[PDB]
Design a protein around this ligand. Structure first.
Ligand SMILES: C=C1CN(S(=O)(=O)c2ccc(C)cc2)CCCN(Cc2ccccc2)CCCN(S(=O)(=O)c2ccc(C)cc2)C1
Lengths: 449, 31, 61
């Protein structure tokens, strides 16, 4: 890391708070951070010749909190990429005052890959032929995306240094999902057609149809079963899935942990059903989105190849190949028409989520062996058990808890996709889990006070 | 290294936003 | 050969769910209120930012 310090000391850093910021002020700073992120999401880049082409990275716009043709086109890619690069370098033993140097290195690597990602996005023909834009326009777009990625990194540091209530990744993903749901609920954008004005928001459309149309029953049924714009059934399904995920996320196994090193601090260690909070969903969505974008690029460039055809076949939704069986069915009638695809999708979702959950407990350090080591270090024992049988109890509970939590969160995603809820299964599950993380932070701060 | 606070971060984000807006305005006037 | 592992996993999951601490109506109401508040905050801030920036994007672009 000694060859990188001069370049590690040239980027801005957030100073740690002297005191411990109160919960109210941390909420205010989280609101300010998400406001800045949204405002930048709504501001287009300069130099855009045309955005008529289909978005190649349309499937990453939810897991990366991105927005095409704007200052947060790359979304939270700086944070995610810097974290993964630093973790991979730690695995390769290359990477290792130490905290400040580590943060500087992660910022520098994230910004380098932000430049690379801006180059890739420009060269994808997203904004037009790069030859037609020219070196000046491409460089301006790269500079804007570079500075925006710097701002994203600074906002994540603001959140994670004690000014905010978490990480930029979760906050921005949940913010974009909630924005999408509220937009589909309350959009004033009217879509004129043969009938007339039709607000793109379901509730505004309901009010408009009730106020204008003479046949009130026809207006209600239309507003509930629109097939061109958001439904009211879609919001009803979104609320129902919200409630179900909220119910299933409060499940926990309460271990009565006692203390041996220091006596008289009887407590409870909760092993949640959702042991890995939305990590299976994040991993599954990242896998499927990367497969989707790779298949779309391969179909665009290398069309007619056998391996490309089996990888995916697009119309832009997949119609055949691996990417088709990895896609939620369009509706329940689609499930009825093709049951084999529905079964394959359900099995893939459940199995992938369960596998990702167990792999993540084995990787992130929440395995039963790791929890037993934590108990030994803190001198904690189970109330009705021994100190040598703690690992056996954790092996009974935690692995099954992680596997079934992944299974249940995948099942909830499948249910939300089948119900046609606004924001799909990934969006709803991610939003609910992130808001529950924020609620857990709130209750932890209250218990501390 | 530079150790900015949260308010400087907000101000610099607003300044980048304003810079993009002025880029758009300058291009609009030039065209 | 996967019948026995699948049955064992089903039994373990059933016993875990039976032994978990399911939320009651007070906890469910508290978590639902917190989730609704957070969703309202983020979604409506984004909604109003988008409404504000639609005419602004129209003017600048
Ligand atoms: C940040 C990403 C998304 N990924 S992610 O797996 O989807 C993920 C998202 C969110 C979370 C919380 C976790 C993981 C995390 C990063 C993983 N790689 C980084 C990387 C790999 C090798 C060398 C350098 C860097 C590769 C994806 C790059 N992409 S790309 O520009 O959009 C993109 C561009 C072309 C094609 C064909 C696909 C995709 C950017």
């Amino acid at each position: 890391l000694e060859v990188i310090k001069p370049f590690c000391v040239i980027l801005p850093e957030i100073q740690k708070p002297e005191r411990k910021i109160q919960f109210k002020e941390k909420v205010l700073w989280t609101a300010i951070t998400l406001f800045i992120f949204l405002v930048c999401c709504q501001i287009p880049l300069f130099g855009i010749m045309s955005s008529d082409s289909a978005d190649p990275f349309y499937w990453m716009r939810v897991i990366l909190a991105s927005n095409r043709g704007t200052l947060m086109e790359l979304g939270i890619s700086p944070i995610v990429t810097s974290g993964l690069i630093m973790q991979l370098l730690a695995g390769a033993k290359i990477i290792e005052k130490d905290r400040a140097l580590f943060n500087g290195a992660q910022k520098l690597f994230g910004m380098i890959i932000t430049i690379g990602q801006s180059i890739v996005y420009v060269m994808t023909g997203m904004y037009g032929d790069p030859s037609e834009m020219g070196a000046g326009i491409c460089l301006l777009i790269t500079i804007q995306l570079f500075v925006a990625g710097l701002i994203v990194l600074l906002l994540d540091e603001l959140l994670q240094k004690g000014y905010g209530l978490g990480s930029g990744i979760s906050l921005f993903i949940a913010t974009n999902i909630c924005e999408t749901i509220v937009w589909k609920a309350f959009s004033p954008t009217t879509v004129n057609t043969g009938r007339g004005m039709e607000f793109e928001g379901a509730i505004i459309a309901l009010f408009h149809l009730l106020a204008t149309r003479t046949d009130k029953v026809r207006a209600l049924r239309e507003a509930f079963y629109r097939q061109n714009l958001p439904n009211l059934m879609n919001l009803i399904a979104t609320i129902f899935v919200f409630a179900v995920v909220i119910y299933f996320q409060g499940f926990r196994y309460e271990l009565p942990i006692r203390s041996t090193k220091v006596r008289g601090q009887i407590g409870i260690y909760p092993i949640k059903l959702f042991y890995t909070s939305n990590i299976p969903i994040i991993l599954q969505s990242a896998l499927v989105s990367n497969l989707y974008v790779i298949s779309q690029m391969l179909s665009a460039r290398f069309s007619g190849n056998l391996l490309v055809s089996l990888l995916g076949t697009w119309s832009a939704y997949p119609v055949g190949g691996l990417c088709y069986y990895l896609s939620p069915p369009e509706s329940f009638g689609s499930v009825l028409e093709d049951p084999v695809h529905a079964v394959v999708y359900i099995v893939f979702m459940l199995g992938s989520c369960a596998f990702f959950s167990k792999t993540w407990i084995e990787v992130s350090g929440s395995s039963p062996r790791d929890i037993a080591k934590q108990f030994k270090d803190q001198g904690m024992v189970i109330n009705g058990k021994r100190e040598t049988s703690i690992y056996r109890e954790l092996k009974k509970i935690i692995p099954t808890a992680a596997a079934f939590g992944g299974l249940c969160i995948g099942a909830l995603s499948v249910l939300a996709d089948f119900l046609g809820a606004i924001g799909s299964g990934t969006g709803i599950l991610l939003a609910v889990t992130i808001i529950y993380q924020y609620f857990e932070i709130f209750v932890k701060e209250q218990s501390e006070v | 290294g530079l150790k900015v606070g949260p308010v400087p971060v907000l101000v610099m984000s607003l300044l980048f936003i304003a810079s993009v807006f002025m880029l758009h305005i300058w291009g609009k006037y030039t065209r | 050969q996967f019948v026995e592992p699948s049955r064992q996993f089903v039994k373990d999951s059933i016993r875990l769910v039976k032994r978990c601490t399911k939320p009651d109506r007070k906890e469910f109401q508290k978590i639902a209120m917190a989730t609704a508040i957070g969703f309202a905050i983020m979604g409506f801030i984004g909604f109003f930012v988008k409404l504000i920036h639609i005419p602004i994007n129209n003017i600048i672009v």
